[PDB]
């Protein structure tokens, strides 16, 4: 019997979000070359299934707060942002023997254009085996 161990781990900076902006604000935690990312690597020879759920932040609606006004954002599994990390809902992953499975996180903020505005929020990322 081989006991499986797994290595897990291990900030979306949208820039300045004060005032107004006409295009989509983007940030990502998805690649080592982009700054770093979350990944899972297990020591076995069989694939290991696991799940990633992301909550809604400090206010459960995914908004950054000024600490003095909010700004809505969302987190996606996809660069094209077709695959939302819907709040608290599991997202399916699988490992490949001997290789790291990234947990990519792409953040976006819709264009403001009208209604001008530090902004912070914390997301709980739950990895379930």
């Amino acid at each position: 019997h081989h006991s499986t161990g797994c290595t897990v781990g291990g900030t979306l900076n949208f820039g300045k979000t004060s005032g107004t902006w006409n295009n989509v604000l983007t940030a990502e935690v998805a690649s080592a070359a982009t700054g770093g990312n979350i990944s899972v690597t297990c020591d076995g020879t069989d694939p290991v299934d696991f799940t990633v759920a992301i909550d809604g932040g400090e206010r459960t609606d995914r908004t950054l707060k000024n600490t003095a006004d909010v700004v809505a954002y969302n987190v996606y599994r996809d660069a094209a942002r077709t695959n939302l990390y819907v709040v608290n809902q599991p997202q399916q992953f699988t490992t490949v023997s001997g290789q790291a499975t990234a947990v990519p996180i792409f953040g976006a903020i819709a264009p403001n254009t009208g209604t001008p505005k530090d902004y912070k929020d914390t997301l709980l990322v739950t990895v379930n085996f």
């Binding site: 797994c6 290595t7 781990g9 979350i38 929020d121 997301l123 990322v125 990895v127 085996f129």
Partner: protein, 206 residues
Amino acid sequence: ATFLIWPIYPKIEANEKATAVWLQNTGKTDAMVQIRVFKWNQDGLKDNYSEQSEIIPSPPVAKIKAGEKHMLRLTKSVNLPDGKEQSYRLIVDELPSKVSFQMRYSIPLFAYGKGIGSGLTEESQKLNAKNALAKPVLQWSVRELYLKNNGQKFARLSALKTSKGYVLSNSTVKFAITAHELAKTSKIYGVDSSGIKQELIEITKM
């Protein structure tokens, strides 16, 4: 921070007072974690968690410096009901315009009463060979696809085939779906990883 977690599928046998899970900060920075164990059931076609006094983690809080491997002790308060598999989740909470991430890691934990075991050791294999229900016994039906486990042990299925997640013991779980492919046979097959090696188990129609 970066953590190595071993084992990822811990268990406590009937004759064992405690088990160990190892947490190692394999990163370059120190980390602070909170360790909790919640009871786990699948009543009402949903995963339910609740506070519990049967498995005690030690320590409940730990500062894990870079490189340091820590041993997490999971102790049974008392003996568990005969012939039954208790289900838990071990929760490791990593404590800390920008949105930051807070990591929570959840792994299953199973503990056994007299007469049943994990089947991951010779001792527990010889035990379950005397027990007709010391295994998952899955039935299926279509409403979405329902899986009812009538055995005393959980199933952990990676794929379902028309021809050759978790479903806890004495529990029914719903999956989204292949329905006409379902209504075209009587038995489907599931790849279960609850035991020592991946194996196909027979899933009969309800």
